[PDB]
Design a protein around this ligand. Structure first.
Ligand SMILES: O=P([O-])(O)O
Ligand SMILES: O=P([O-])(O)O
Ligand SMILES: O=P([O-])(O)O
Ligand SMILES: O=P([O-])(O)O
Ligand SMILES: O=P([O-])(O)O
Ligand SMILES: O=P([O-])(O)O
Lengths: 88, 88, 88, 88, 88, 88
């Protein structure tokens, strides 16, 4: 059933730069679950887990072509909990 | 803005027994924020904070006329965070 | 990959009483993941999530034939995270 | 240096009943650190860790001569963190 | 009543640079409560919530004239919980 | 007895640069417990506490000769909890 999640909205130069694969790889390394997509207003990451380590490493290890201008976070409710981390 | 909350649904003999005032007093003692109401399917408690101590003490210190048959919990999103604990 | 879990060891009159199904139902209601088994020294519950609400409700809603004499907890590492709650 | 702690104030029939040793044993089982004392207004327990499992088990496994009428909690700051659980 | 807070002490080139407004805006975006002031030994931020995302973004999005040389954290007790984030 | 810990594996130019003393000093400032060592595949930090603030500050305040290329984290179980932070 339902659970508390977090949505991150990452804006900047975040498309055509390997950003979704970067996020996926970070999520795999950190054993995170949820998804990533680019919906036209940056990159949206939805996580089951707390985002803090992910956010630290998002910034520090940003791909060389990418540039992160802002990140916003908000809570939301998962309808079903994710069992993988996927690119959508 | 928004924040992760918890809603508790408490069922049993939970009306006409001092239940809403009991919840209010417990919330005051525990410095909790949110609200309590009786909507016809038991008593609904919405909290800003984690509910664990509240739940322990709800059961242990249940008013003598009351009887708690079940408690369910689920997350939800507060649209604005509460600054008091109120009976609604 | 790996994650921090909790193992609970529940002892008492906890077999022949509907205890494993009780635990399963509680875990379903609380959206918990992991497993339950009876290994001859009581009932072992392994969870992905924090156990506090589960423990409160384990005691308060213990099946009428059952009796809980003790519960112990310890951390452990999940090799793979559970995606369901199962009786083993 | 300093850290966030919790103080619990447990009132009732909580002296002459094995209460301080009960608390000590519970703290040992739960791998908690801090102290317990009886200062004339019940029993005060100060912990380094979150108190929720402790509180559940305090109530459920209360010694047979004892009776717990109320428990209050408040935060405080440890000046030095405790490395044992002691009766004071 | 009282609650566990965190105080951050941010030192460097952190005055005359838009630092207090920067902190305020970050706190608004992150839905944080507490206050910020410059007391002559850098900038002090007191929060009700965990500071981790705030700290990540403090560093990454530091105003261009500012420079953060160090940040220290310590717990403290709020006498009353804050309902806004304010510049003091 | 046992408790949930975190192990961090920090790789890059992290030897001959004051890295272990840097970690020790950070851990002292943050009131952390555990240890640091260089085992030939970077620097391993084991903590009792959550690592998030530590990780933020590890990156931001990296010694000038050092360079951090990657950090990985995983949970593990402490056999005994640490009471100091030590260089091993
Ligand atoms: O288009 P991407 O590869 O930057 O996600
Ligand atoms: O009707 P109440 O007093 O039990 O809430
Ligand atoms: O044998 P059980 O039904 O008490 O688990
Ligand atoms: O006096 P005590 O043994 O109940 O603590
Ligand atoms: O003086 P401030 O604008 O840097 O706070
Ligand atoms: O060899 P270290 O000083 O960089 O730890």
């Amino acid at each position: 059933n339902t659970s508390c999640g977090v949505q991150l909205r990452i804006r900047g130069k975040v498309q055509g730069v390997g950003f979704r694969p970067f996020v996926w790889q970070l999520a795999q390394q950190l054993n995170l679950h949820g998804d990533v997509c680019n919906d036209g207003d940056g990159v949206e990451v939805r996580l089951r887990e707390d985002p803090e380590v992910f956010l630290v490493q998002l910034y520090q290890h940003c791909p060389p072509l990418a540039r992160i201008d802002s990140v916003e976070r908000e809570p939301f409710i998962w309808s079903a909990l994710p069992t993988e981390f996927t690119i959508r």
